[PDB]
């Protein structure tokens, strides 16, 4: 019980950056999207 | 998935759906602000902001900071997922609930719907408890003037979280219905990222005051980039195997199995079992042992963390050892003429497979275990210690982003 990455293959090994830079601008577009809410739930009340 | 996600936004149905999500998101971050009609909202939090109510540390997070302020999303979207294991426990001992669930998707609606009414009942019990012992028992400690620490306040709060957990529930049932994807998942992941946020801009004016620094705030976040650029290749990893066929449509191509096929399901349910033994002992501030079992498992303390490492690892493996994929697989390799080199059907198709998910989900969920350990070592090493960065709420910072740009692509590869 000690797998060799033998006949093992990944259709994926260059897409790293491109794929990483999407796991980045997805989440660098959620908190701000979340933060656009509290800020706007702050204009009317004030 | 960076230039393509942009051109995926250039598709006015795929594009469209990511906004209705915002519509809820807004209203959801909105629900993320709403006090209790009787809790001195003003006297609820920093009891919960303590090594005594900060044991509540985990509930605040997933809900979305909502617990501390005790918002209508206080419990968040919890009391439907701790009914997702007892039901995943009521799924194999009840050998017909899948037969209901799998003979068309309209036999998992009942499942979903009984899970929902129970998911309203549970969230009427988890509040039925935080009142009976926590807010109430102390007196007018956490509470408004005039209001009674008895039944009428206890009743103005039951409906605060039953149209407050029913609301966050619904937010899933209407994004999933007519907007994009699964409102769920999404709804937990956002709850961490909004708690993984202002501490950052605390940090910069602190990297101004003295307060930590650029280089502790270099090593903590380059780690976050080692998290984006690894987990993915891993999610799109696989072992490819040769087969052949002999002398009526379909596929003849090669068949690979993922090192790890799902990074999410096994890590979520893992956060789950991590909960019950903490929140059962958490509301007893007087008995010294229950106050041990609540601070130990604290996954932001080296031991609970060690148990957090564990549970995230082996839940990967054994949920990477439940569902009916290999059986489904073995049959379509059967009615249509296929086979593996040198390999027989029957028992040496059992032990030739029993060797592999004993070879993959070893190096695999190890990753997920080490994935769970070190931000606390980071939080034993750097400049911040908050239950958010317990390393659980980035796993999905990664994860959600990924599977989205992993199923959107899978949505486009269908038209």
Give how far A24 is from chain B: nearest CA, Å.
Answer: 7
Chain B CB contacts of A38 below 8 Å:
29, 32-33
User: Could you give the CA distance from residue B229 to residue A25 in angstroms, rounded to a whole number?
Assistant: 13
Backbone φ and ψ of B225, nearest 5°: -85, -30
Resolution given for this structure, in angstroms: 6.0
- Euclidean distance between the first and the last CA atom of chain A, given in angstroms as a whole number: 64
B139: left (phi over 0), alpha (psi -120 to 50) or beta: left
Chain B CB contacts of A31 below 8 Å:
193-194, 196-197
CB contact A14 to B (< 8 Å): no
B216-235 and B395-412 are packed helices; what angle lies between their axes, rounded to 10 degrees? 40
Chain B CB contacts of A27 below 8 Å:
193, 397-398, 400-401
Is-contact B73 B54, C-beta < 8 A? no
Q: Quick one: tokens of B339?
A: 């086979």
User: Could you give the CA distance from residue B314 to residue B320 in angstroms, rounded to a whole number?
Assistant: 9
User: Could you give the CA distance from residue B216 to residue B219 in angstroms, rounded to a whole number?
Assistant: 5
User: Could you give the CA distance from residue B115 to residue B98 in angstroms, rounded to a whole number?
Assistant: 14
Out of B240, B358, B402, closest to residue A23 by CB: B402
In which element (H, E) is residue A19 found?
helix A16-20
* Residues listed for chain B: 415
User: Could you give the CA distance from residue B318 to residue B92 in angstroms, rounded to a whole number?
Assistant: 14
B14-31 and A31-40 are packed helices; what angle lies between their axes, rounded to 10 degrees? 50
Q: Quick one: tokens of B131?
A: 């009142």
B148-155: Cβ within 8 A, 24+ apart: B153/B38
Sign, CA torsion B103/B104/B106/B111: positive
User: Could you give the CA distance from residue B30 to residue B27 in angstroms, rounded to a whole number?
Assistant: 5
CB contact A9 to B (< 8 Å): yes
List B239's β-bridge partners, or say none: A8, B257
User: Could you give the CA distance from residue B73 to residue B161 in angstroms, rounded to a whole number?
Assistant: 7
- For residues B68-102, b (16+ Cβ closer than 10 Å) or e, as one string? bbbbbbbbbbbbbbbbeeebeeebeeeeebbeebe
Q: List, in order, residues 6 or more apart from B241 with CB less than 8 Å away.
A: A7, B254, B255, B256, B257, B340
Q: Quick one: tokens of B23?
A: 């519509």
Query: What does the domain layout of chain A look like in residue ranges?
Result: 1-46
CB contact B240 to A (< 8 Å): yes
CB neighbours of residue B42 within 10 Å: 11
List A8's β-bridge partners, or say none: B239
Just give the CATH number of B1-415. 1.10.3370.10
Just give the CATH number of A1-46. 1.20.5.1030
């Amino acid at each position: 019980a000690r797998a060799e990455l033998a006949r093992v293959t990944w259709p994926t090994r260059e897409q790293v950056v491109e794929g990483t830079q999407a796991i980045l601008l997805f989440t660098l577009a959620f908190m701000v999207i979340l933060g656009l809410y509290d800020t706007v739930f702050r204009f009317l009340i004030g | 998935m960076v230039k393509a996600f942009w051109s995926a936004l250039q598709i006015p149905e795929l594009r469209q759906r990511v906004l209705f999500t915002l519509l809820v998101l807004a209203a959801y971050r909105l629900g993320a602000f709403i006090p209790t009609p009787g809790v001195d909202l003003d006297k609820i939090q920093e009891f919960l902001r303590t090594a005594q109510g900060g044991v509540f540390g985990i509930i605040n997070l997933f809900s979305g900071g909502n617990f501390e302020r005790f918002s209508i999303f206080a419990l968040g979207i919890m009391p439907y997922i701790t009914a997702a294991i007892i039901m995943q426990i009521l799924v194999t001992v009840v050998p017909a609930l899948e037969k209901l669930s799998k003979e068309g998707e309209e036999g998992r609606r009942i499942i979903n719907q009984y899970t929902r009414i129970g998911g309203i009942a549970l969230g009427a019990f988890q509040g039925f408890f935080l009142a009976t012992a926590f807010l109430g028992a102390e007196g007018g400690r956490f509470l408004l003037p005039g209001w009674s620490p008895g039944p009428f306040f206890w009743f103005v709060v039951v409906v605060t979280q039953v149209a407050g957990i029913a609301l966050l529930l619904w937010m899933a049932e209407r994004i999933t219905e007519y907007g994009i994807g699964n409102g769920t998942s999404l709804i937990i992941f956002a709850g961490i990222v909004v708690e993984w946020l202002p501490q950052i801009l605390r940090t910069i004016g602190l990297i101004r005051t003295g307060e930590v620094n650029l280089v502790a705030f270099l090593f903590f976040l380059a780690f976050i980039v080692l998290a984006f650029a690894g987990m993915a290749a891993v999610q799109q990893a696989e072992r490819r195997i040769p087969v052949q066929y002999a002398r009526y449509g379909g596929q003849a191509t090669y068949i690979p199995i993922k090192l790890n096929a799902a990074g999410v399901i096994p890590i979520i349910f893992a956060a789950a079992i991590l909960q019950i033994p903490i929140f059962l002992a958490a509301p007893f501030q007087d008995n010294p042992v229950l106050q041990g079992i609540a601070n130990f498992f604290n996954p932001t303390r080296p031991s609970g963390l060690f148990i957090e490492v564990l549970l995230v690892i082996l839940f990967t493996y054994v949920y990477t050892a439940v569902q009916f994929d290999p059986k489904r697989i073995a049959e379509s390799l059967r009615e249509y003429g296929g086979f593996i080199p040198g390999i027989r059907p029957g028992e040496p198709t059992v032990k030739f497979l029993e060797h592999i998910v004993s070879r993959l989900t070893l190096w695999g969920a190890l990753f997920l275990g080490l994935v769970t350990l070190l931000p606390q070592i980071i939080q034993n090493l750097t400049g911040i210690h908050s239950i958010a960065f317990s390393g659980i709420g980035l796993l999905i910072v990664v994860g959600v982003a990924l599977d989205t740009l992993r199923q959107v692509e899978s949505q486009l590869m269908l038209r």
